[PDB]
Every structure is written in structure tokens, then in C-alpha cells.
Amino acid sequence: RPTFYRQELNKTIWEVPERYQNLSPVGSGAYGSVCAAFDTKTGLRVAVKKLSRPFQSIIHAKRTYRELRLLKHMKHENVIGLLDVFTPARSLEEFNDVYLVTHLMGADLNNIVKSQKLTDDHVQFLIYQILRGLKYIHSADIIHRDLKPSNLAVNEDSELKILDFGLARHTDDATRWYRAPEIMLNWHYNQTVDIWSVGCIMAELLTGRTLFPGTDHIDQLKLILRLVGTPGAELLKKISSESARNYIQQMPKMNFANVFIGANPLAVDLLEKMLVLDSDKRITAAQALAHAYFAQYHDPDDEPVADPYDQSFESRDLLIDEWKSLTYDEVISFVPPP
Numbered sequence: 001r002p003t004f005y006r007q008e009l010n011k012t013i014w015e016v017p018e019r020y021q022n023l024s025p026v027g028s029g030a031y032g033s034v035c036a037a038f039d040t041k042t043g044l045r046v047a048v049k050k051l052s053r054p055f056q057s058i059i060h061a062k063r064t065y066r067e068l069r070l071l072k073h074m075k076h077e078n079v080i081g082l083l084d085v086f087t088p089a090r091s092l093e094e095f096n097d098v099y100l101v102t103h104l105m106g107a108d109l110n111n112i113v114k115s116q117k118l119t120d121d122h123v124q125f126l127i128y129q130i131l132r133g134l135k136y137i138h139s140a141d142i143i144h145r146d147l148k149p150s151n152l153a154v155n156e157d158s159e160l161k162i163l164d165f166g167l168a169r170h171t172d173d174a175t176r177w178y179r180a181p182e183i184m185l186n187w188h189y190n191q192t193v194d195i196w197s198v199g200c201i202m203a204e205l206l207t208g209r210t211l212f213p214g215t216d217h218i219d220q221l222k223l224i225l226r227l228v229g230t231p232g233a234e235l236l237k238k239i240s241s242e243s244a245r246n247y248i249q250q251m252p253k254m255n256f257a258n259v260f261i262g263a264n265p266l267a268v269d270l271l272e273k274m275l276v277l278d279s280d281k282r283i284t285a286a287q288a289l290a291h292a293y294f295a296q297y298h299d300p301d302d303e304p305v306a307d308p309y310d311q312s313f314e315s316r317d318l319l320i321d322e323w324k325s326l327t328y329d330e331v332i333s334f335v336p337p338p
């Protein structure tokens with residue numbers, strides 16, 4: 001077992017193995033607290049997260065287990081994963097704090113873009129990576145559901161990782177804009193809700209402007225439907241509720257070639273396939289990777305899928321100490337990546 005040391009940062013007490021040196025605050029919130037550190041074992045700059053009240057309640061405990069299970073399963077270049085998980089506890093009976101370690105990330109997609117058009121080649125590379133990560137996430141039967149530029153970390157090499165959180169804003173420094181209409185309308189949904197978000201992101205990277213900057217929930221839907229049209233006959237046949245059919249209903253789809261003026265025609269074609277109203281007809285991540293737009297990056301032998309992901313715990317109602325013990329097992333069984 002490593003030697004630990006204690007340090008106070010922004011009024012939060014940190015107890016970490018000596019390998020993590022030079023702790024500096026990154027941020028804190030409902031998520032707990034995050035510090036940056038230097039990992040002396042690897043020479044990497046890392047972020048360390050101390051979870052907030054991980055076993056305070058059944059729900060917190062289950063949330064902690066969920067978070068750790070997911071992070072341990074996600075092993076892909078374009079998805080956030082774990083370098084380390086630790087606890088100062090020497091036994092289950094002492095186990096009260098959980099610390100997670102990953103690569104320190106310093107910028108998100110908004111930070112790289114800065115309200116500017118990116119070049120088409122840069123868009124290809126970034127969207128390729130998002131789709132590559134999504135193919136992996138979706139293959140684990142996970143839907144991200146909240147994909148947006150703030151959840152996309154991008155380093156100086158434009159290497160991209162999909163996050164389920166936003167990076168901390170410097171102390172001296174809408175979500176709905178990327179949400180699929182079926183979620184906005186409360187309609188059954190599939191993994192292509194995330195593909196909608198990617199289409200929104202891609203549009204913005206190409207044009208330098210938010211595709212659907214709705215002022216509120218109703219406005220958001222109005223902006224979406226102006227582009228993608230009111231539901232056609234085939235989609236209306238799939239809406240089970242009378243009131244729902246009575247509600248959504250009046251203009252036809254716009255021709256995206258007349259919207260995304262000067263864009264690569266293959267980009268326009270891909271956007272048409274991602275921004276389809278009917279989610280049954282929306283392109284999947286795997287299909288999108290094979291689209292001609294990505295011909296310079298696509299490698300069908302290097303777009304891996306995840307191992308099957310057992311999420312049966314989601315259906316279980318257990319006690320705190322049970323979730324705590326399951327979590328502790330997961331801490332102990334952790335094997336760092338190479």
C-alpha cells in the first residue's frame with residue numbers, strides 16, 4: 001500500500017498517495033472537488049477528483065458505484081477513462097472516500113472553436129473522433145444523452161475525449177441547443193439522440209454559429225422544425241398519443257445545401273443524415289464513420305467496440321453498505337491501463 005499524505009485545498013481536505021504531487025485546485029461543485037497533480041510514477045499531469053459524500057445515502061452510494069463501474073469499463077482513446085482510483089481506507093470498515101484519477105484536461109471544444117469557423121479538415125478530424133468515441137459508448141448500450149461542446153475535451157493536438165461533465169471554469173474567467181427534438185418533446189428514443197447532438201456540433205464548427213440557439217424549450221423546437229420540417233406521414237404514424245400528434249403540428253424540410261452555404265458537399269450530406277427528425281432514420285455512429293466525409297481518417301480496423309457492459313445493478317434496490325461493499329470491490333479490482 002502506498003504512503004499517503006494530507007493537504008487542504010479550497011477548504012477541502014485531500015488524502016492522496018505520495019505519487020500525486022503538487023496538488024492545485026481545479027474546481028469544486030455538486031460533483032465533489034477536483035485538483036490537478038503531477039503523477040510522479042508516470043510523469044503525467046493528472047486530475048484527481050474527490051467524490052462528495054459518496055456513501056451518505058443509498059442513492060449516493062449507488063451513484064458512486066455507477067460512476068466507478070462506468071469509468072472502469074470505458075477504455076477508449078476518445079472517451080474519458082481512469083488512470084487510477086484510490087481510497088485512504090485500508091479496509092471496507094474504514095471506507096468513506098473515493099478518489100478518481102484521469103489525465104488533466106485543459107480545454108473543451110468551445111475553447112478550441114472560440115465562435116470561429118473551423119477548417120473543413122479540422123472539422124473532419126474532430127467529428128471523426130466524437131463518432132469513434134460514440135460508436136464505442138453505444139456499443140456498451142450506453143446513451144450519452146447530453147452531448148455538447150462543453151462535454152468534449154480537446155487538447156493542443158486536437159485529440160478529443162467525450163466527457164460526462166464540463167471542465168471547471170477559471171475563477172477569473174444552453175444545454176438544450178444540442179438536444180434531440182424527441183427528448184425536447186418527451187417522445188421512446190434510441191442512441192441516435194447523440195447523433196443529433198453531433199450534427200448540431202458539426203454544423204456549428206463549420207459555420208461558426210449555433211445551429212439551433214433557442215431562447216427556451218418552445219423556441220428550441222420551433223428552430224429545429226424550421227430546418228428539419230414538421231413530421232412527415234411516416235413519422236406521424238409512429239406517434240402513439242393523440243395529444244402528441246395534435247401538438248407537434250407546419251413547414252417542409254429545408255435543403256441543407258442552401259443552409260450550409262460553401263460547406264464541403266460531403267459535410268452537407270452527413271448533416272442531412274444526422275439531423276433527420278425521425279430517429280429511426282438517423283444515421284448511427286458506426287454508419288457515420290464509414291461516410292465519405294471521413295475518408296482521410298476512417299479505419300474500419302481501428303474503431304473499436306466495448307466489451308458487453310452489465311448494467312443489471314441499475315434495477316437493484318440495495319442497502320448503503322451493500323453498494324459501499326460493491327464499490328470497494330471495484331476499487332480493489334482496478335487495474336491501471338498500460
Ligand SMILES: Cc1cc(-c2nc3cccnn3c2-c2ccnc(NC(=O)c3cc[n+]([O-])c(C)c3)c2)ccc1F
Pocket residue numbers: 026027031034036047048049071080081082083100101102103104105106107165166167168169170
Ligand atoms: C473521471 C474523473 C473526472 C474528473 C473530473 N470531474 C470533473 C467535474 C467537473 C469539472 N471537471 N472535472 C474533472 C476534470 C478531469 C480532468 N481535467 C479537468 N480539468 C479542468 O477542469 C481544467 C479546467 C481549466 N484548466 O485551465 C485546467 C488546467 C483544468 C477536470 C477528475 C478525475 C477523474 F478521474
